[PDB]
Amino acid sequence: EITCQENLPFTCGNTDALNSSSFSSDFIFGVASSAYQIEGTIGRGLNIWDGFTHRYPNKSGPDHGNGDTTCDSFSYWQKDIDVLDELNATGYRFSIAWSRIIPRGKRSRGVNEKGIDYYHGLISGLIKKGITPFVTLFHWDLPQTLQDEYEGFLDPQIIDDFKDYADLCFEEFGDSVKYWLTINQLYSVPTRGYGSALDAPGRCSPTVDPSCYAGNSSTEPYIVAHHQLLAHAKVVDLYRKNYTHQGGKIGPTMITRWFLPYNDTDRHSIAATERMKEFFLGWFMGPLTNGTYPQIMIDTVGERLPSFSPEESNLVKGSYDFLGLNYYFTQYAQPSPNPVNSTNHTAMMDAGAKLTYINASGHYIGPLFEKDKADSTDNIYYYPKGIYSVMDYFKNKYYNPLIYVTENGISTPGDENRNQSMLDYTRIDYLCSHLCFLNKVIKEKDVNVKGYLAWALGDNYEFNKGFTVRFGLSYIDWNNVTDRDLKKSGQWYQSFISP
Amino acid sequence: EITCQENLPFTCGNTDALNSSSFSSDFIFGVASSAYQIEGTIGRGLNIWDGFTHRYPNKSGPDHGNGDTTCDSFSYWQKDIDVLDELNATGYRFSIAWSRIIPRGKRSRGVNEKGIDYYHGLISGLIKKGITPFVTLFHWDLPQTLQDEYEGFLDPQIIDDFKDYADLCFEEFGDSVKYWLTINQLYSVPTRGYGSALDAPGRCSPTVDPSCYAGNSSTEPYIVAHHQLLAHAKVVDLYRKNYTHQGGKIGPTMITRWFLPYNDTDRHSIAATERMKEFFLGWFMGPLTNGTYPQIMIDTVGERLPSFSPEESNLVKGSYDFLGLNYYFTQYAQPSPNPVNSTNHTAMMDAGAKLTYINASGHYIGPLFEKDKADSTDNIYYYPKGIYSVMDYFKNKYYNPLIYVTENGISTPGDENRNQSMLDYTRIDYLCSHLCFLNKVIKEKDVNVKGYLAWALGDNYEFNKGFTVRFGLSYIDWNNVTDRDLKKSGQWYQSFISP
Ligand SMILES: *[C@@H]1O[C@H](CO)[C@@H](O[C@@H]2O[C@H](CO)[C@@H](O[C@@H]3O[C@H](CO[C@H]4O[C@@H](CO)[C@@H](O)[C@H](O)[C@@H]4O)[C@@H](O)[C@H](O[C@H]4O[C@H](CO)[C@@H](O)[C@H](O)[C@@H]4O)[C@@H]3O[C@@H]3OC[C@@H](O)[C@H](O)[C@H]3O)[C@H](O)[C@H]2NC(C)=O)[C@H](O[C@@H]2O[C@@H](C)[C@@H](O)[C@@H](O)[C@@H]2O)[C@H]1NC(C)=O
Ligand SMILES: *[C@@H]1O[C@H](CO)[C@@H](O[C@@H]2O[C@H](CO)[C@@H](O[C@@H]3O[C@H](CO[C@H]4O[C@@H](CO)[C@@H](O)[C@H](O)[C@@H]4O)[C@@H](O)[C@H](O[C@H]4O[C@H](CO)[C@@H](O)[C@H](O)[C@@H]4O)[C@@H]3O[C@@H]3OC[C@@H](O)[C@H](O)[C@H]3O)[C@H](O)[C@H]2NC(C)=O)[C@H](O[C@@H]2O[C@@H](C)[C@@H](O)[C@@H](O)[C@@H]2O)[C@H]1NC(C)=O
Ligand SMILES: *[C@@H]1O[C@H](CO)[C@@H](O[C@@H]2O[C@H](CO)[C@@H](O[C@@H]3O[C@H](CO)[C@@H](O)[C@H](O)[C@@H]3O[C@@H]3OC[C@@H](O)[C@H](O)[C@H]3O)[C@H](O)[C@H]2NC(C)=O)[C@H](O[C@@H]2O[C@@H](C)[C@@H](O)[C@@H](O)[C@@H]2O)[C@H]1NC(C)=O
Ligand SMILES: *[C@@H]1O[C@H](CO)[C@@H](O[C@@H]2O[C@H](CO)[C@@H](O[C@@H]3O[C@H](CO)[C@@H](O)[C@H](O)[C@@H]3O[C@@H]3OC[C@@H](O)[C@H](O)[C@H]3O)[C@H](O)[C@H]2NC(C)=O)[C@H](O[C@@H]2O[C@@H](C)[C@@H](O)[C@@H](O)[C@@H]2O)[C@H]1NC(C)=O
Ligand SMILES: *[C@@H]1O[C@H](CO)[C@@H](O[C@@H]2O[C@H](CO)[C@@H](O)[C@H](O)[C@H]2NC(C)=O)[C@H](O)[C@H]1NC(C)=O
Ligand SMILES: *[C@@H]1O[C@H](CO)[C@@H](O[C@@H]2O[C@H](CO)[C@@H](O)[C@H](O)[C@H]2NC(C)=O)[C@H](O)[C@H]1NC(C)=O
Ligand SMILES: *[C@@H]1O[C@H](CO)[C@@H](O)[C@H](O)[C@H]1NC(C)=O
Ligand SMILES: *[C@@H]1O[C@H](CO)[C@@H](O)[C@H](O)[C@H]1NC(C)=O
Ligand SMILES: *[C@@H]1O[C@H](CO)[C@@H](O)[C@H](O)[C@H]1NC(C)=O
Ligand SMILES: *[C@@H]1O[C@H](CO)[C@@H](O)[C@H](O)[C@H]1NC(C)=O
Ligand SMILES: *[C@@H]1O[C@H](CO)[C@@H](O)[C@H](O)[C@H]1NC(C)=O
Ligand SMILES: *[C@@H]1O[C@H](CO)[C@@H](O)[C@H](O)[C@H]1NC(C)=O
Ligand SMILES: *[C@@H]1O[C@H](CO)[C@@H](O)[C@H](O)[C@H]1NC(C)=O
Ligand SMILES: *[C@@H]1O[C@H](CO)[C@@H](O)[C@H](O)[C@H]1NC(C)=O
Ligand SMILES: *[C@@H]1O[C@H](CO)[C@@H](O)[C@H](O)[C@H]1NC(C)=O
Ligand SMILES: *[C@@H]1O[C@H](CO)[C@@H](O)[C@H](O)[C@H]1NC(C)=O
Ligand SMILES: *[C@H]1O[C@H](CO)[C@@H](O)[C@H](O)[C@H]1NC(C)=O
Ligand SMILES: *[C@H]1O[C@H](CO)[C@@H](O)[C@H](O)[C@H]1NC(C)=O
Ligand SMILES: O=C1O[C@H]([C@@H](O)CO)C(O)=C1O
Ligand SMILES: O=C1O[C@H]([C@@H](O)CO)C(O)=C1O
Ligand SMILES: *[C@H]1O[C@H](CO)[C@@H](O)[C@H](O)[C@H]1F
Ligand SMILES: *[C@H]1O[C@H](CO)[C@@H](O)[C@H](O)[C@H]1F
Ligand SMILES: [Zn+2]
């Protein structure tokens, strides 16, 4: 019987009690990254994360930081591979920058051969060290030209441009890459990019945020989500029909959270909690498993929810070989009003739930996850058991999928000095406590989880936060980014992998 | 009789001998700037100078500097107006960033009302202090979307997109702005943007520079130059036919140089010198005054030179109310081969001339203008009399135009400390020596020059050089850009203006 801790102090950092041998022998362990966050702009065209961070610098992060140079993995990709080789990692998730291989967005306008060569060399280097690539085609960095031509994922023109981009990736790299991710965290762009305007492209209703250049927070998240599912599904169909000879697998990436009732004896809070599962996970997993949105979304969202045609439903349903599940935290849910006629209505209000980290009796769900210095009542707290709950739920509700955990990690403050930053025991605690629960759910519930990629390989630009927080298992000095030095967490993870 | 100095030391910095009263009473004196160089990216879309500087950082400048934040005239426009008010300037040349008012390039895609408001407030503030705006519609900062859709000025689609942009500017600002410039320095984008790839967008033949993403240095400069003339002319026609009620004037900006023979008794050098006038100035002034390219260009460039249709010739010919002439230096010309079949052929070789600052007997043309630290044999030297020669030539060859000198200035090294940077006596010498010759040519040749705008109002990002050189008459500290402090040159210029 496996027992895992939920509260500090944790004791799972002792590799005598928890290590890679605790898991099946074929289980993949590694780390993850994304292109905007690590490469720099050298050698690529511009994308909407360059656009957004430069047009709205106070949204890029409190330091106004951006991905212009970051850790310079364009130049130092080899040092990334060396970190992985030090860890004895068997997997690495990275993303291809669309703007590096097709700077003009539309494939017919030409490809960047040097960009293609950059990824060829990375892939070859990973394979030579025994590292399996997990490659994200789209980690939010849409070529700016596409957002300016037709507002990107707001328009159905995105589908064929994304399809032609993916086809190029499969043709150039699919002989070596066998695990593809389509769109990173399906929920995020619709809500943050087109609802709250916290992320690129930065669209929203005028009274939500007067700085947005355009938008409608009540309708656009649904339009964008719908086009994401269609573009994803078109790419999966293309892969499965035209690249089956490569013997690979493809899937979407979901951001997952677990939800618990703010008051577990209050039927209204219990109902809000179930609505949150449907509106947060089911918005995408209903279409992916059944070709339809959840009925509660159909009922609440009404005319603002697009319909799939029979052909589209068939394309979307079953459009995955596996799921990349990212998991960071869990929230308590209580009822909240849904003012659909307010000018500041957002799609996020449709779930009729308010989310917190503290329940009605005052219990904080778990240890600190992210301090909010402007507002401490907005701190985020984590919940190790949530990874168990999420995986169990996906097996039970969503037809026993093959899963890879494609992101899991925690930040530390950018104000810490180097010594403090390297002594990242809070990161060991977070990673180990989640890995304990992950092993427990695999053993107890028989969830088909086959790998785990911790967020992040090294310190990088964090969307919305600049360089004010660090997520790496390896440390990068912003005054001289060449080296990636394993932190205590990286050193721990090395021992966990090879105990 | 007016006597002006050509060599150090200069004595024209004494406002007892040379001041604004030396010129006609209506003569306009001020300074100039451009949007990419001073505003920052906040509040605007992305353009090809953001694209080029980020994709090719070592081409942005030796420090990899760019216009991301620069002197922050987005926030500190008022401080610009305060510099002008301190100088008692009567003119200011600035440019409108296309990407600030139409971030999506094509006007039908929507306008940025806040961007429009930014220029409204600047214009209103200048007029309230008695400063006449001279507004450049296009100072090289093409929206990136247009370069990605159709390669910008390489394609004739540019004409209508530029026309619709200009129409928006005339409609919103033309009730207050009475002096418009269309395209800054017509010669520069074709040659540096599409020939040598020193400037955005960075296209050239593969063997000229392997880093270019695409191009053809032998043909594209001519295509781009042709489209620039057509787009310019379409905008002038639009202005003169639809905005005549505003009672303003419009014209192009030329970069001018004078040319002298490397050996003034050698017929081959003399011929190369006359070819340079035609290929450098006549490339654009032939079309602007006669609707045709110079015959030497027709003969040499052959099938690589586009033809104007009769309708186009008529549109281009006479398409100016005045000329904005920029002037910095003069070169000696000697013959050089034109290897049209070489894979590294460039349009610039078609003139059959090699340019230097030293003549065949070893005479340097004038004082130092720009030190080149990698290569001292590549230093640039200036020649005060060249402004006299250029203005005389334009009056004689080009039908006695109305002229405004829209840029004239000199850099100092960015390595100098603040104290050294403020003690910019070499800038007083450069400005005064040119102003002496300008007054002399107006009096002796009766050239219709009606204003002078010195480059630059304040320190800014310099195309190709980052922040490694300074051109301002006012100093900006890059660690805290709010203030613009008049340097010795600014203080001199203040006394010259109000002696
Ligand atoms: C898995 O996908 C399956 C579909 O492949 C989901 O089942 C479909 O569920 C929908 C409800 O979402 C049912 O559709 C209703 O059909 C009524 C019956 O119509 C049929 O007979 C008529 C009935 O009187 C008739 O007019 C119609 O022409 C057919 O003859 C409808 O009236 C319902 O429409 C009303 O409600 C809609 C909101 O639900 C609203 O948008 C419509 O305007 C209308 O007010 C609905 O009809 C649908 O109307 C919209 C139109 O665009 C659709 O094409 C039309 O079908 C389906 O009949 C049912 N299909 C079958 C094959 O079962 C399944 O839903 C789950 O299971 C069903 C049993 C139900 O309990 C759902 O609540 C639950 O979500 C999806 N599973 C999951 C887990 O999501
Ligand atoms: C100011 O603009 C005026 C035009 O508005 C320029 O004058 C034009 O100059 C061109 C030369 O550039 C002369 O065109 C030549 O016409 C010959 C005569 O053709 C007429 O009679 C025929 C002659 O035998 C006949 O086929 C033709 O159909 C007419 O009947 C031509 O053969 C020349 O073409 C050859 O040379 C071209 C290069 O110059 C080459 O590109 C052609 O392939 C061909 O080999 C030329 O014909 C031109 O051919 C190209 C075609 O696209 C043009 O439409 C076609 O005209 C013009 O006759 C002359 N027009 C008039 C109204 O004078 C003027 O040029 C300056 O002045 C003229 C006198 C000449 O000295 C030029 O060298 C000098 O540049 C421009 N001024 C300035 C200062 O640039
Ligand atoms: C977890 O949720 C439960 C279920 O909602 C909370 O228990 C309920 O708390 C209500 C108070 O918020 C109780 O109602 C009140 O009962 C007192 C005694 O009769 C009465 O004077 C009140 O005016 C009030 O009555 C309601 O008034 C509004 C009407 O619309 C409604 O019909 C009335 O019910 C309610 O009885 C109680 N329900 C149960 C099943 O116990 C629970 O609240 C926490 O426990 C209750 C026992 C009470 O001690 C609360 O003070 C305490 O907050 C909530 N838990 C937390 C920690 O918030
Ligand atoms: C300014 O340009 C002028 C005109 O081109 C230069 O003067 C010319 O310089 C040529 C030498 O580069 C002289 O030709 C030479 O004459 C000597 C004496 O006969 C002879 O031995 C040479 O081999 C050579 O002759 C030429 O050989 C090549 C044949 O294709 C050609 O037909 C021959 O002419 C030429 O006479 C002279 N022309 C004139 C009109 O004086 C001038 O060069 C400078 O001055 C000349 C006098 C001489 O002192 C050069 O050393 C000195 O460089 C050049 N000025 C500068 C400063 O470069
Ligand atoms: C968001 O777009 C929706 C749909 O166009 C707008 O909601 C409509 O508002 C129009 C004008 O009131 C109403 O007539 C419709 O009944 C509403 N339609 C539905 C689908 O709700 C909404 O006003 C726009 N919001 C913003 C802030 O512009
Ligand atoms: C530049 O474009 C020109 C015109 O397309 C190319 O020059 C031609 O080269 C083709 C192939 O040799 C020749 O057949 C033509 O005679 C040339 N045409 C003329 C107008 O010169 C040139 O090769 C291209 N340069 C680059 C480097 O691609
Ligand atoms: C690995 O952890 C398991 C418990 O799952 C333990 O039994 C085994 O000894 C550990 N391996 C090492 C080398 O410490
Ligand atoms: C498959 O590739 C072939 C050849 O390029 C193409 O005709 C077909 O439409 C492609 N399709 C998909 C997504 O099935
Ligand atoms: C608008 O929304 C903000 C946040 O959603 C909320 O605090 C405020 O009450 C809302 N106001 C109206 C008029 O609904
Ligand atoms: C930067 O870091 C690299 C690797 O540690 C080091 O070799 C190089 O000398 C450092 N550069 C400077 C300027 O210190
Ligand atoms: C790498 O991991 C493999 C598989 O578990 C192991 O046998 C090998 O010893 C490890 N290497 C190091 C250097 O840890
Ligand atoms: C201005 O310069 C002129 C010479 O052009 C001189 O005569 C006049 O006195 C000067 N004005 C002042 C105020 O110094
Ligand atoms: C003038 O404006 C009118 C009305 O918008 C338009 O019809 C006409 O084509 C414009 N033209 C130019 C450039 O003359
Ligand atoms: C190519 O050009 C460079 C500069 O134009 C020149 O130095 C070199 O000789 C040229 N080579 C050939 C093969 O023409
Ligand atoms: C920056 O310069 C402005 C103007 O001189 C000054 O008022 C402000 O205090 C300075 N900021 C800092 C941080 O020194
Ligand atoms: C401004 O220039 C005008 C015109 O020459 C002059 O009369 C006025 O005194 C000057 N003001 C200052 C403060 O120099
Ligand atoms: C930050 O930026 C936006 C403009 O992009 C501006 O509307 C807003 O006031 C600024 N936010 C704060 C809190 O300063
Ligand atoms: C600078 O950048 C380009 C890539 O953009 C590269 O080809 C070239 O080698 C670099 N230049 C130098 C001298 O390092
Ligand atoms: O739940 C979530 O976790 C991540 C991030 O907030 C973790 O730092 C994210 O993008 C979500 O929507
Ligand atoms: O002659 C020229 O002067 C300027 C610049 O070099 C002055 O710094 C330029 O853009 C030209 O082509
Ligand atoms: C997963 O979350 C990490 C932590 O916030 C982000 O850096 C990744 O880009 C996101 F995909
Ligand atoms: C005129 O030249 C100045 C000096 O190089 C540049 O800064 C301007 O942008 C150019 F238009
Ligand atoms: Zn930048």
- Classify burial at B416, counting beta carbons within 10 Å of its beta carbon; exposed 0-12, middle 13-18, buried 19 or more: middle
Omega before A201 cis (within 30°)?
Answer: yes
* β-strand partners of A31: A92, A454
Q: Give the Cα-Cα-Cα angle A198, A202, A207 (nearest 5 degrees).
A: 85
Q: How far is CA A413 from the centre of its chain?
A: 20
Alpha helices in A305-424 (DSSP H): 310-316, 385-397, 418-422
Q: How many CB atoms lie within 10 A of CB B419?
A: 7
- Nearest CA-CA partner of B167 in B89, B279, B243, B71: B243
Resolution (A): 1.5
Look at residues A115, A128, A300 and name the one whose alpha carbon lies nearest to residue A218. Answer: A300
The single residue listed with the structure tokens 């090289």 is: B140
Q: At what angle do helices B113-128 and B157-173 cross, to 10 degrees?
A: 50
Best CA proximity match to A324, nearest among A181, A448, A141:
A181
Q: Which of A248, A229, A393 is nearest to A316 (CA)?
A: A229
Could you give the CA distance from residue A405 to residue A30 in angstroms, rounded to a whole number?
10
| Geometric angle at alpha carbon A444, from A438 and A446, rounded to 5° | 80
Q: Using CA atoms, how far apart are residues B389 and B401, in angstroms rounded to an integer?
A: 15
Structure tokens, B330: 């003069």
What span, in angstroms and rounded, lies between the C-alpha atoms of B295 and B283? 10
E-strand spans in A357-479? 368-370, 380-381, 402-407, 412-413, 448-455, 469-470, 474-477
| CA distances for A39 relative to A35, B46, B54, angstroms | 5, 19, 12
CB-nearest to B46 from A110, A144, A214 is: A144
- CB contact under 8 Å between A148 and B68, yes or no, is no
Identify residues of A whose CB sits under 8 angstroms from chain B CBs: 41-46, 50-51, 54-57, 68, 103-105, 109-110, 112, 143-145, 148-149, 213-214
DSSP string, A37-54: HHS-STTS--BHHHHHHH
Query: Distance between CA atoms of B60 and B466, rounded to whole angstroms?
Result: 6
Identify from B49, B145, B151 which residue to disrupt to test chain A contact, counting A C-beta atoms within 10 A and taking the largest count: B145
Residue A397 backbone class (left: φ over 0; alpha: ψ -120 to 50; beta: rest) = alpha
CA distance linking residue B169 with residue B177, whole number of Å: 10
- Cα–Cα distance, B93 to B492 (Å, whole number): 20
Q: Which two structure tokens, joined as six digits, stand for A33?
A: 């990254």
Q: How many CA atoms lie within 13 A of A78 on its CB side?
A: 2
Q: For atom 3 of ligand 22, which residue has the closest CA?
A: B455
Which residues lie below 8 Å from residue A316, measured CB to CB, with a gap of 6+? A229, A230, A232, A233, A287, A288, A291, A308
Phi/psi for A92 (5° steps) reads -145, 125
Residue keyed to tokens 């090719």: B56
Per-residue tokens: A187: 């929920």
Neighboring chain B residues of A42 at a CB cutoff of 8 Å: 54-57
Burial class (CB in 10 A: 0-12, 13-18, 19+), B446: exposed
Asked if A452 and A28 count as a contact pair (C-beta separation under 8 A), the reply is: yes
Among the bound ligands, the one closest to the CA of B27: 16
- Residues of chain B found within 8 Å of residue A54, distances taken between Cβ atoms: 41-42, 46, 50, 68
Count of positions (residues) in chain B: 499
- Distance CA(A200)–CA(A50), nearest Å, equals 9
Q: Which DSSP letter does residue A416 get?
A: S
Of A43, A104, A112, the CB nearest to B148: A104
The residues, ordered by sequence, that sit 6+ positions from A216 with a Cβ below 8 Å of its Cβ are: A203, A204, A205
Cis peptide bond prior to B310, omega within 30° of 0:
no
The verdict on whether residue B203 carries a ligand-binding annotation is no
What residues contact A335, with CB distance under 8 A and at least 6 apart?
Answer: A268, A269, A271, A272, A352, A353, A354
Residue B273 near residue B360, CB atoms below 8 Å? no
Half-sphere exposure of B126 (CA within 13 A, CB side): 25
Which of A70, A106, A109, A213 to substitute to test the interface with B, most B CBs within 10 Å? Answer: A213
Using only C-alpha atoms, chain B has a radius of gyration, in whole angstroms, of 21
- The 10 Å Cβ neighbour count of residue A241 is 8
- CA of B328 from ligand 22 middle (Å) equals 9
**Contact yes or no for B149 and A149 at CB 8 A:** yes
Q: How was this structure determined?
A: X-ray
Write out the E strands in A43-171: 91-95, 132-138
- Note the Cα A412 to chain centre separation in Å: 18
Beta-strand ranges (E) seen in A87-188 are 91-95, 132-138, 179-183
Burial of B339 (0-12, 13-18, 19+ CB in 10 A): exposed
| Tokens 């209505």 sit on residue | A345
Provide the b/e sequence for B39-66 (b: ≥16 CB within 10 Å): bbbbbbbbbbbbbbbbbbbebbbeebbb
Work out whether strand B412-413 and strand B132-138 pair parallel, antiparallel, or are unpaired. Answer: unpaired
CA B461/CA B63 separation, integer angstroms: 11
Measured in angstroms, the CA of B281 and the nearest CA of chain A are apart by 34
Tokens representing A207 are: 């009274």
Q: Which residue has the tokens 């969503």?
A: A398
Instruction: Print the SS3 string covering A96-113.
Output: CCHHHHCCCCCHHHCCCH
What SS3 class is residue B425? helix
Discontinuities in chain B with C to N beyond 2.5 Å fall right after none
Q: Is B363 annotated as a binding residue?
A: no
Spell B121-131 as b/e; 16+ CB within 10 A means b: ebbebbeeeeb
In this structure, how many other beta carbons lie within 10 angstroms of the beta carbon of residue B246? 17
In angstroms, the Cα distances linking A472 to A18, A420, A467 are 21, 13, 11
Rounded CA separation B131/B120 (Å): 14
SS3 for B23?
Answer: coil
What architecture (CATH level 2) is domain A1-499? Alpha-Beta Barrel (3.20)
| Shortest alpha-carbon distance between residue B57 and chain A (Å) | 7
Q: How far apart are CA A328 and CA A387, in angstroms?
A: 8
Beta strand pairing call for A448-455 and A469-470: unpaired
Cβ–Cβ under 8 Å, residues B339 and B314: no
| Alpha helix segments (H runs only) across B19-107 | 35-38, 48-55, 57-60, 77-87, 98-101
Q: What ligand 2 atom has the least distance to the C-alpha of B291?
A: 2
Structure letter (DSSP) for residue B278: I
Peptide bond into B252 cis (omega under 30): no
A294 with A288: CB under 8 angstroms? no
Alpha carbon distance B356, B276 (integer Å): 12
Say whether A431 sits in a helix, a strand or coil: helix
Torsion angles phi and psi, residue B326, rounded to 5: -95, 145
Residues in a beta bridge with B85: none
Nearest CA to ligand 7 atom 7: A17
Residue A189: partners with Cβ closer than 8 Å, 6 or more residues away: A140, A153, A183, A199, A224, A228
- Per-residue tokens: B301: 């460039």
DSSP label of A456:
-
A69 residue type, one letter: T
DSSP for B431-452, please give it: HHHHHHHHHHHHHHH--EEEEE
Alpha carbon distance A455, A469 (integer Å): 13
Place of tokens 């089911």: A282
For chain A, what are the domain ranges?
Answer: 1-499
Of B163, B154, B166, nearest to B190 (Cα)? B154
Residue nearest (by alpha carbon) to ligand 21 atom 5: A462
Burial class (CB in 10 A: 0-12, 13-18, 19+), B495: middle
Using alpha carbons only, give the angle B263, B266, B271 rounded to the nearest 5 degrees: 95
Name every residue whose Cβ is closer than 8 Å to that of residue A347 and which is 6 or more positions away in sequence: A190, A191, A195, A217, A218, A219, A220, A221, A222, A301, A304
Our CA-based measurement puts residue B252 at a distance from the nearest CA of chain A, in whole angstroms, of: 28
Q: Cα dihedral angle (B49, B53, B56, B61), rounded to 10 degrees?
A: 120
Structure tokens at B12: 């024209």
Classify the phi-psi angles of B147: left when phi > 0, otherwise alpha if psi is within -120 to 50, otherwise beta.
Answer: alpha
Using DSSP bridges, classify how beta strands A480-486 and B28-32 pair: parallel, antiparallel or unpaired. unpaired
Pairing of strands A323-335, A253-261: parallel
User: Going by DSSP bridges, is the β-strand pair B323-335/B402-407 parallel, antiparallel, or unpaired?
Assistant: parallel
Instruction: State the first-to-last Cα distance of chain A, in angstroms, to the nearest integer.
Output: 21
Nearest-5° Cα angle at B53, B136 to B458: 50
**Neighbour-count burial of B187, counting CB atoms closer than 10 A to its CB (0-12 exposed, 13-18 middle, 19+ buried):** buried
Phi, psi of B455 (to 5 degrees): -90, 140
CB count within 10 Å of CB A78 equals: 11
Length of chain A: 499
Give the residue numbers of B marked as catalytic.
Answer: 407
B42:A54 CB<8 A: yes
The set of residues, in sequence order, having a beta carbon less than 8 Å from that of B328 and lying 6+ positions away, is B255, B257, B369, B382, B407, B408, B409, B410
Residue A107: closest CA among A162, A163, A164: A164
Q: Do B148 and A45 touch (CB under 8 A)?
A: yes
Reported as type and span, the H/E element at residue B94 is strand B91-95
Q: Which residues of A touch B149 (CB under 8 A)?
A: 104, 145, 149
- Scan for tokens 């690129």, then name that residue: A200
- Token code pair at residue A427: 């990161």
How many other C-beta atoms are found inside a 10 Å radius of the C-beta of residue A63? 12
Peptide bond into A287 cis (omega under 30): no
Residue B335, classed as helix, strand or coil, is strand
Angle (CA) B422 B460 B468, round 5°:
75
Residue B55 has its nearest CB partner, among A41, A55, A105, at A41
Helices (H), A347-398: 385-397
Is residue B315 within 8 Å of B233, Cβ to Cβ? yes
Q: Which amino acid is at B323?
A: L
Ligand 22: residue of B31, B38, B199, B407 to mutate (most ligand atoms within 8 A of CB) is B407
Beta-carbon contacts of B178 under 8 Å, excluding residues fewer than 6 positions away, are: B132, B133, B246, B247, B248, B249
Residue position matching structure tokens 């427990």: A440
Strand partners, A402: A448
Suggest the residue from A106, A145, A209, A461 to mutate for an interface test with chain B (most B CBs closer than 10 A).
A145
**At B439, phi and psi to the nearest 5?**
-60, -45
Helix (H, G, I), strand (E, B) or coil at B292: coil
Taking contacts as CB-CB distances below 8 angstroms, the residues of chain B near A55 are 41-46, 103
Helix H segments across B174-276? 188, 194, 220-242, 267-276
Extract the tokens encoding B40. 């920052």
Q: Rounded to the nearest 5°, which phi and psi values hold at B456?
A: -115, 165
Do residues A12 and A430 lie in contact, with contact meaning Cβ atoms separated by under 8 Å?
Answer: no
